[PDB]
Amino acid sequence: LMPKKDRIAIYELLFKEGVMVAKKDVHMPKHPELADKNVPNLHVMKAMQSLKSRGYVKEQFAWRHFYWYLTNEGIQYLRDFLHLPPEIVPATL
Amino acid sequence: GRVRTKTVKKAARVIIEKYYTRLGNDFHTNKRVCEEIAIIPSKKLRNKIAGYVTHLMKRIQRGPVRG
Amino acid sequence: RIRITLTSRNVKSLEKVCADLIRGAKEKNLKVKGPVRMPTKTLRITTRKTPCGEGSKTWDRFQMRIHKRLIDLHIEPGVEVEVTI
Amino acid sequence: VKDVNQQEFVRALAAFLKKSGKLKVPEWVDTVKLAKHKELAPYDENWFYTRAASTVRHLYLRGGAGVGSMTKIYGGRQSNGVMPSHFSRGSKSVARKVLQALESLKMVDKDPSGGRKLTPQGQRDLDRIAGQVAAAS
Amino acid sequence: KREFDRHSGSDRARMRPEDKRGGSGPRNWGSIKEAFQEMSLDEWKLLQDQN
Amino acid sequence: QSVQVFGRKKTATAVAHCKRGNGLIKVNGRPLEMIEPATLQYKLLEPVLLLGKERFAGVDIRVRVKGGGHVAQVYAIRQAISKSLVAYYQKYVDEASKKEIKDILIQYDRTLLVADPRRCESKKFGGPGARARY
Amino acid sequence: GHQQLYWSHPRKFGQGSRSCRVCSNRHGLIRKYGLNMCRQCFRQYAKDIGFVKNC
Amino acid sequence: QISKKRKFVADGIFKAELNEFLTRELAEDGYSGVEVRVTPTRTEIIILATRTQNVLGEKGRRIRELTAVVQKRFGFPEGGVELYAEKVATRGLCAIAQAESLRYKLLGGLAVRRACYGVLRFIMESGAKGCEVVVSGKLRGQRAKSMKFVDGLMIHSGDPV
RNA sequence: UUGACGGAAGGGCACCACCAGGAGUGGAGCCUGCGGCUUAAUUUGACUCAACACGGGAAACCUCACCCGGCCCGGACAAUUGACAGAUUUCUCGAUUCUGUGGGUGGUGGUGCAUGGCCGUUCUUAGUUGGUGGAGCGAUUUGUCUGGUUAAUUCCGAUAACGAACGAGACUCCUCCAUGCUAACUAGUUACGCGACCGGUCGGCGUAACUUCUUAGAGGGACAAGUGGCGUUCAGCCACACGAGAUCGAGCAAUAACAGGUCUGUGAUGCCCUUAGAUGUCCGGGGCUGCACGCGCGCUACACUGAACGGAUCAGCGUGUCCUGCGCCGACAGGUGCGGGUAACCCGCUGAACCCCGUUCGUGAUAGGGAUCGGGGAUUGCAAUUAUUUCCCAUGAACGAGGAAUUCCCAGUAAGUGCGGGUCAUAAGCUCGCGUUGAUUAAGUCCCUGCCCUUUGUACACACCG
Ligand SMILES: [Zn+2]
């Protein structure tokens, strides 16, 4: 349960670049990349968990951090969720 | 505990059987000969080899060595 | 006057770039001060070998040596360079 | 202050410092003990003259000491009962009040760099006592 | 603490490892036999906010 | 005309500055007979009592010591003074007078001219010290 | 008032306000030289950091 | 402003975390370590892999995803870190590459004697003076078995190891 | 036949064995760890070496896994949010929890007898294995041995074996010097001027010479080399001269084994179990500190070879964004302002302790011992009560070298002595290091206790836990 403003701020950042990182810290007040927006770090790791469970994102782990990558299924889903044309692409494409 | 390993003794015998004319009864002279005619990766091993060459050279002058 | 600080964890690669710095600057007719060798620093870490408490009190000692040399005139991986005035 | 025995030097300098009745000698010299690691007060009644003679002697040898240094100079072993003994610094107020007492005699002044050093007057007075102990030996 | 440690406390495996089917089988150890690019989202947020 | 010779105990490095002049022997500015340990006062006077004051009556010696303990500095001072006179008699006096000094100091105690390499051993885990165990 | 109560215990010191940067473990931690990793994970990454055994 | 004692440690902790992250990521890509060359201007990461075509994406997107993941994890500025995937030769002389080649034959379910003996000869023909493969664990049974495979000579003690 | 084992024989080695001795431990108090008791819980792992100051485990909360109370979902994926008031009524958020059926998830939950990885131990003992040749139908054997020697299956020698590999050694890091190089305003010396004091002192100030002291690079040096003696005059040993040394201290460490430790180090992990009235998770409070007791590592002692009081005088390892210097306040513990140091720069010439030199104390349970308690001052922190530590005053216990037993140790070693690191908001009676002072005895032996090897025996081979 996260606000719709914070729900799209995580996806826009995930779509602006091609990757998404987050330290496994459910008690971290603000995400280091989403510092201007009052987005709790728990919302970032829990919103990316819903994307992983639907084949949209693949994850990794380096001792405290997740490493999320937008797949071809996830790029098209965010393209419809953010109401974007087929013309835009992430920074990794 | 002054027993030489087979690495020291075997290398010393091959040096004599190939460079008997260059060696003598002086360690410091044989120490420089073995440094050139043999590529020894260590200096302590060279001093052990050259020191046993000097020992064997004192035996050759009195008779044949079984090795 | 420029002071060049050179800090590395391996003396061979640290003195390799140190000699090339002195030689590379001596051909330019620059009066340079010799390489001042700072006292080496050994980062001691004495840990317990076993991941439990059953080991026979066997500790393992680690070292991380940081050699420091400065050059006062008027790069290989593992060597840090920092110039001053 | 060298060329003579330093243990008889501080005893003769304290006698000169007591015969010259100008030292401060605070009121609590009868109640205080010179360190937290000490069990009893000094046996000698005139301990403030003995310490002042020894303090000005340390400033002759190593100037710019200060209160924190004289606290370390006069430190010692601290018995902790059934626990092992450690080093303990001396008294800070005793070291501070004995430094200000030497300054009233113009023998010690504030060092420009660090703490307090010896004055040309104090260096003269210490060398005079150093000559008396040499002739008396 | 166990009295007889070497005595296996199971009827499925002893203290000495015993292979299944003598090492033969797919997931077994092995028997002793003979075998040898257009604009990104940053630009889209400007084109939609300039009108 | 002066030499600077060092004498080394465990960690006591005493450097004697043997320089021509009168019979002056001082340690850190203090006279030789004024060092705090009076029990070891004769150990510091062995180079003078054996060689005689006439050999030291032409050179000033100013020893500077640092490191080690009280006893280590004693053996380092007497070693620096012993070798500083030998090194002085070698570069500014004839070699015959050097052997006349060395044979007196070596026959009495070799530690006046040769430092012993004994140092503290590293502590091993599982014990209170180097050798002892728990 | 759960937002003012969840994770409201002051954690600015002690063994609870710090953990291993490798496995989130709070025991056997090594705080020297800014390692901030438990004693069991340092032995694993000793060569990768640069700590070798000479004696 | 960080001291040199903590700086050289922080440089080693970064290389330790960077190497381990690439093991869990480039496992099926023949990853065999990295070389971090830090310069005062920028930092370049050299990835060593036996299959470089997989370290790079279909058009070079995975290499873009790794360099974008490293700049965000370690606070590197945009365009401040560069990753260069390299190809290591003589795969038989790489212990990490041969451990991956053996692991991908075990999960396929061939054997532990036919698989290790096959990977033991690939190392010997690659110019190695000696090899040693040890497979421990449980397989087809409750009890764990240790299958050791040696070839040539192996130095165990001393500094040359 | 090869292993394993033996309560069979022989041989050998090792201060985790002995001998000769040192310091002890066991006795006292106390600090801690483990049982046993008690307990809403007194989490739990480990129990001969190879459990018991161990899990780097010195637990105020957190840690935390235990106990009793209350929230929270952090319920992937295929309407609902918060909240003022007081002990129930309103307002607010807006598709983000929609309730169920699916069946994810997380554990300091079980299983170390399902495992990985590390580690301990066998054993840091010297052991282990190809090629070719030889013996045997063969498994296998020989090499890999009667003996001598060595720290060592280290070597010589004997020799159906010869030549080799791993281990040992070599190697790596260490300290011992080298007035010879390379260089040093983040190291110093010396000569100089300057200036304070009575030619001596000056870590009191200044930039020219150059590297002894300091730092650290390179290259040297030591190899039983030289001499004498003992020896298959071999392998080596012993004693000497020379010399900075005539066995220096770690690290690494084979074949192979344990039902050794660890699931409570891991987003190492199989399975089982618990899954929202939770074994998840958070926040309070308590516990792990609980005490008739039986033990294990330790500290302090039982003094005059000493306690005190005072004088004097010497370290090294190392750490520092927190380490700390000066001027003030206070009796101490503290406080306070101004400072320095991300460091060979500041702390810092690390003015350490023991020790040394005076001064009183005088078989004395005493100025030995400072345990147990009272009354106060401070510091750390959100908060110390079950006293966190610390200071001051007072209280002044057992303990007069310690039973049967038992531990460690051969030279800068034992022991004494203090320092630093780790733990650390507060922080050492622990441990890892460091220097300081500095010995007695021993250069030997299988007597004991431990393993190793050969021979021998076996109905054992899951291998005597047979
Ligand atoms: Zn960890």
Q: Is residue E8 within 8 Å of E14, Cβ to Cβ?
A: yes
Cross-strand pairs, A68: A20
Q: What angle do CA H71, H74, H75 make, to 5 degrees?
A: 70
C32: closest CA among C15, C50, C20, C45? C20
CB-based contact C9 G50, cutoff 8 Å: yes
**Closest Cα in chain C, distance from residue G16 (Å):** 21
For residue F50, give every residue at least 6 positions away whose Cβ sits within 8 Å of its Cβ, in sequence order, or none. F104, F105, F108
Nearest chain D Cα to F25, which residue? D3
Q: Give the span between the Cα atoms of D39 and D85, in whole angstroms.
A: 14
3-state secondary structure at position F81: helix
Tokens matching residue F58: 């032409």
Q: Give the span between the Cα atoms of B25 and C21, in whole angstroms.
A: 47
Phi, psi of A47 (to 5 degrees): -75, -35
First to last CA, chain B: 22
The bridge status of strand F2-8 relative to strand F13-20 is: antiparallel
3-state secondary structure at position A66: strand
Q: Give the span between the Cα atoms of C64 and C83, in whole angstroms.
A: 24
Q: What are the angstrom distances between the C-alpha of D28 and each of D70, D94, E50?
A: 19, 10, 83
Tokens matching residue E43: 């630009």
D126-135: list long-range contacts, CB under 8 Å, 24+ apart.
D126/D1, D126/D13, D126/D56, D126/D57, D126/D60, D127/D1, D129/D1, D129/D9, D129/D12, D129/D13, D129/D16, D130/D1, D130/D2, D130/D3, D130/D4, D130/D9, D132/D12, D133/D4, D133/D5, D133/D8, D133/D9, D133/D12, D134/D3, D134/D4
Mutation choice for E interface testing from A16, A75, A88 by most E CBs within 10 A: A88
CB-based contact H8 C77, cutoff 8 Å: no
Question: Which of C45, C49, C63 lies at the smallest CB-CB distance from G32?
Answer: C45
Residue F122: nearest nucleotide (C-alpha to C1'): I249
Q: Give the span between the Cα atoms of C9 and C42, in whole angstroms.
A: 10
The bridge status of strand C65-73 relative to strand C36-42 is: antiparallel
Region of D81 on the Ramachandran plot (φ > 0 left; ψ -120 to 50 alpha; else beta):
left
What is the residue whose two structure tokens read 């004055």?
A: D119
3-state secondary structure at position G14: coil
List strand residue ranges (DSSP E) for chain D, in order.
76-80, 83-88, 108-110, 116-118
Length of chain G: 55
Q: Would you state the torsion angle of the CA atoms of residues C72, C75, C78, C84, taken in this order, to the nearest 10 degrees?
A: 30
Q: Give the span between the Cα atoms of C60 and C50, in whole angstroms.
A: 10
**Taking CB atoms and an 8 Å cutoff, what residues of chain H touch C66?**
4-5, 8
Tokens matching residue B45: 């091993």
H80: closest CA among H93, H67, H91, H92? H67
What is the number of H-type helices and E-type strands within chain B?
A: 3, 0
**Closest Cα in chain A, distance from residue H120 (Å):** 32
Phi, psi of E50 (to 5 degrees): -95, -10
Taken in order H19, H24, H25, H26, is the CA torsion positive or negative? positive
Give me the resolution in angstroms, 1 decimal. 2.4
**Residue F37: how many CA atoms within 13 Å on its side-chain side?**
15
| HEC per residue, chain H | CCCHHHHHHHHHHHHHHHHHHHHHHCHHHCEEEEEEEECCCCEEEEEEECCHHHHCCCCCCHHHHHHHHHHHHCCCCCCCEEEEEEECCCHHHCHHHHHHHHHHHHCCCCCCHHHHHHHHHHHHHCCCCEEEEEEEEECCCCCEEEEEEEEECCCCCCCCC
**Taking CB atoms and an 8 Å cutoff, what residues of chain G touch C62?**
46, 51-53
Q: Give the span between the Cα atoms of F17 and H78, in whole angstroms.
A: 63
Phi, psi of A32 (to 5 degrees): -65, -30
Q: What are the angstrom distances between the C-alpha of B9 and each of A80, B5, B54, B57?
A: 82, 6, 12, 13
Residue F130: nearest nucleotide (C-alpha to C1'): I413
CB-based contact H8 G50, cutoff 8 Å: yes
The DSSP 8-state label assigned to residue F25 in this structure reads: E
Q: What are the angstrom distances between the C-alpha of H37 and each of D19, G45, H74, H82, H87?
A: 75, 19, 15, 10, 17
3-state secondary structure at position E38: coil
C11 CA – I219 C1', rounded, Å: 16
Q: How far from the centroid of its chain's Cα atoms is residue D107's Cα?
A: 13
Tokens matching residue E40: 């990104």
Q: Is residue H36 within 8 Å of H19, Cβ to Cβ?
A: no
Residue D41: nearest nucleotide (C-alpha to C1'): I309
For residue C59, give every residue at least 6 positions away whose Cβ sits within 8 Å of its Cβ, in sequence order, or none. C46, C47, C48, C49, F125
Strand I nucleotides in reach of protein CB atoms, 7 A cut-off: 16, 29-31, 45-47, 50-52, 54-57, 60-64, 71-72, 74-78, 81-84, 94-97, 104, 108, 113-121, 149-152, 154-158, 164-177, 179, 182-186, 189-191, 196-198, 200-205, 212-218, 220-226, 234-237, 244-245, 247, 249-262, 264-268, 282-284, 297-301, 307-321, 324-334, 342-344, 347-349, 351-360, 369-371, 381-382, 390-393, 408-419, 421-426, 428-438, 462-463, 465-466
Q: Is residue D60 within 8 Å of D118, Cβ to Cβ?
A: yes
Taken in order F67, F68, F74, F77, is the CA torsion positive or negative? negative
- For residue B3, count CB atoms less than 10 angstroms from its CB and return exposed for 0-12, middle for 13-18, buried for 19 or more: exposed
CB-based contact G23 A27, cutoff 8 Å: no
A80-87: list long-range contacts, CB under 8 Å, 24+ apart.
A81/A8, A81/A11, A82/A8, A82/A11, A82/A12, A82/A15, A82/E41, A84/A15, A84/E41, A84/E44, A85/E44, A87/E38, A87/E39
D62: closest CA among D134, D114, D7, D9? D114
The DSSP 8-state label assigned to residue C8 in this structure reads: E
What is the residue whose two structure tokens read 């070998």?
A: C49
Beta-sheet strand order (sheet of A65-70) = A19-23, A65-70, A57-58
